[model samples]
Target: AVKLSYDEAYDNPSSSLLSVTCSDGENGLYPKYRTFGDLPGFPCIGGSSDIAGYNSPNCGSCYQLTYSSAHTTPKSIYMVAIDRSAEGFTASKQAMDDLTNKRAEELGTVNVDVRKVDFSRCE
Candidate 1:
């Protein structure tokens, strides 16, 4: 596989930049996911878990893992983010399959939740 440097990638897309951008990953990659780094955390697993177990005093019993911030109010979200570049070329279902599907298949079910916000036709 050819490892494309940042400059080379933007300069030209392989095979004439495929006409249908929707089916292409690198086609709409950059413009779509440039600012996701600044969004609020998912607040799903660890975050919502923390909030659900909050209280005034003696809140240890409420939380799942109470080693950190047992009784604090309005704690900042502990987020997990794949950077802009990764989100573009390396975070899609196709990308994942290309990278880890074989190995993951050996392990077990690889559940995917694909929620997308389109930007190509927005403007």
Candidate 2:
């Protein structure tokens, strides 16, 4: 895995400069998930189990990830921090598998970076 120091990560905010990874949440979630750290409608990632529910309150937080190799336009996405690694956001297995098909050749996962801009209006 390509590891970046905090300074490097912050310094280079371009998606081309950083790596973003995706995980598949095999299990579908209930309308209201039951677990240790569930807040009302908190965002979640794939691979999260009911027992290990995500605890971050970053629900409604949004992101815009640009897949330079796959697509030219930047995909404005959202983050609901379920119990998964916060390095990146979560997506459905089906969704990630689709991306993997497109960008996995260079790296097993999509290498992306975040731009410090406001996408609140898109929400």
Which candidate comes out best when scored by TM-score? 2
Candidate 1: tens digits of C-alpha lDDT, residues 1-123: 111011122222231212212222432222333332222221111111111211312111111111112233322111221212212121222222233322323422222222222222111
lDDT string, candidate 2, 1-123, tens digits: 111111112122222201211112333232233331232222212221122333322322333333444545544322232333434444433333343443422344565553323435223
Residue clash pairs of candidate 1: none
The backbone clash count of each candidate, in order, is 0, 11
| Angstrom error at residue 111, model 1 | 3.8
TM-score of each: 0.18, 0.35
- Global local distance difference test of model 2: 0.31
At residue 106, candidate 1 shows an lDDT of 41
